[model samples]
Target: GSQKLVFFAEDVGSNKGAIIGLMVGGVVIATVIVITLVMLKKK
Candidate 1:
């Protein structure tokens, strides 16, 4: 998709920013999964 290309192009050259973004995203995703599992276990 052209839109996808454009989106990626915006971040193409910033390796530092991309790495930081991935790290932050991983943390948030992990936290969300942990919370979801805890809730399911309680049910």
Candidate 2:
């Protein structure tokens, strides 16, 4: 009953962290590129 719910959400919870972590990393990389472009265009 309640045990089934706990196990199901727990399994997905592990993968959830990795999915979000990758997206956060991608965003940081994109931000760096945009900033570099802006600085170069100033000239």
Candidate 3:
């Protein structure tokens, strides 16, 4: 797993970025889901 070492510090050092990324991703996903639902309902 030598190749995975490059990501060790990146993801473990601090979770601030990760949390922000997760929140942003969650909002985008939710928006997409709502739009999809509305589109489907329109049909």
Candidate 4:
């Protein structure tokens, strides 16, 4: 029988900031879209 080991590396060190920015931007865009849709439906 053979044993297997898994090792994870911190490869996304630089991407951490980019990921956060993308998440924030996504939330803003989604919020704007929802507000716009609601306004249109109300009219």
Candidate 5:
């Protein structure tokens, strides 16, 4: 039920500013991954 979901395609792409933003965004995404991993480890 949880995994069987659907996401309607919206849109997506990037530039120099996008590169910088991606760098910062990577850190933010990494933090989320770490927090999620810590909170929900595989059983």
Candidate 6:
């Protein structure tokens, strides 16, 4: 497979934006897991 260069929002090479994105992703994932657990427990 050829590694075609791709950028998510933008490249992650030494970019503060990538770091910020990771922080935001962590928050979103934590929120989602908590909500999922609550919903699953209701079953």
Ranking by lDDT: 1, 3, 2, 6, 4, 5
Q: Which ten residues in a row have the lowest lDDT in candidate 1?
A: 7-16
Give the range of the ten consecutive residues with the poorest summed lDDT in model 5. Answer: 5-14
Shift of residue 25 alpha carbon in model 1, Å:
1.0
Superposed Cα deviation of residue 34, candidate 5 (Å): 0.6
Which residue pairs collide, candidate 5?
Answer: none
Summarize candidate 3's per-residue lDDT along 13-43 as a digit string, tens digits: 5777789889999999999999999999996
Give the TM-scores of the predictions, in the order they appear: 0.57, 0.50, 0.58, 0.57, 0.46, 0.55
Which candidate ranks first by lDDT, i.e. highest? 1
Per-residue lDDT of candidate 6, residues 1-43 (tens digit): 3344555334545677778889999999999999999999986
Candidate 2 lDDT tens digits, 1-43? 5688778777865677788879998999989998999988986
Q: Kindly indicate the candidate among 2 and 5 with the higher TM-score.
A: 2
What is each predicted model's overall lDDT from 0 to 1?
Answer: 0.87, 0.84, 0.86, 0.75, 0.70, 0.79
Worst 10 residues of 4 by lDDT: 1-10
What TM-score does candidate 3 reach? 0.58
What TM-score, to 2 decimals, does candidate 1 have? 0.57
Clashes of each: 0, 0, 0, 0, 0, 0
By summed lDDT, the worst window of 10 consecutive residues in model 2 runs over 8-17
Please identify model 3 stretches exceeding 4 Å from their true place: 1-13
Clashing pairs in 4: none
lDDT of 1 by residue, 3-28 (tens): 88887878686687779889999999
Poorly placed runs, candidate 6 (over 4 Å): 1-13
